[PDB]
């Protein structure tokens, strides 16, 4: 639903997550942004694991 | 500079790219958003190269 999505975005600070990812993207301006986004989230996943 | 960032974002369709990933994110609503986005972009990456 649309309300479930809005809720999810708020509860999990998705907006701030995008902001941080864009900040990174603009610092790096990678040849390959998908590869870069992959590594960026991989790094953050590892933080939230240990 | 800021202008180089705006330019990069437009040139590389960054906005739609990110938006598409969040739309998927909103459908799945995973307990682990980071892991999901990681897997999401890993998939798009593999077709980037």
């Amino acid at each position: 639903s649309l309300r479930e999505c809005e809720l999810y975005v708020q509860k999990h600070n998705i907006q701030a997550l995008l902001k941080d990812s864009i900040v990174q993207l603009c610092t790096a301006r990678p040849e390959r942004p998908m590869a870069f986004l992959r590594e960026y989230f991989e790094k953050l996943e590892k933080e939230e694991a240990k | 500079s800021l202008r180089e960032c705006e330019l990069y974002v437009q040139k590389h369709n960054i906005q739609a790219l990110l938006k598409d990933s969040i739309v998927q994110l909103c459908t799945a609503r995973p307990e682990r958003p980071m892991a999901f986005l990681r897997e999401y972009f890993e998939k798009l990456e593999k077709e980037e190269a």
Binding site: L2, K19, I22 | C5, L18
Partner: peptide, 27 residues
């Protein structure tokens, strides 16, 4: 630097809008 982050916020809020829109079109 603050210029950057300010711009990142603007863009992120843009994406969040387009996401909500696309989420009304689907259900």
């Amino acid at each position: 630097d603050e210029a950057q982050e300010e711009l990142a916020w603007k863009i992120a809020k843009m994406i969040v809008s387009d996401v909500m829109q696309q989420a009304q079109y689907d259900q």
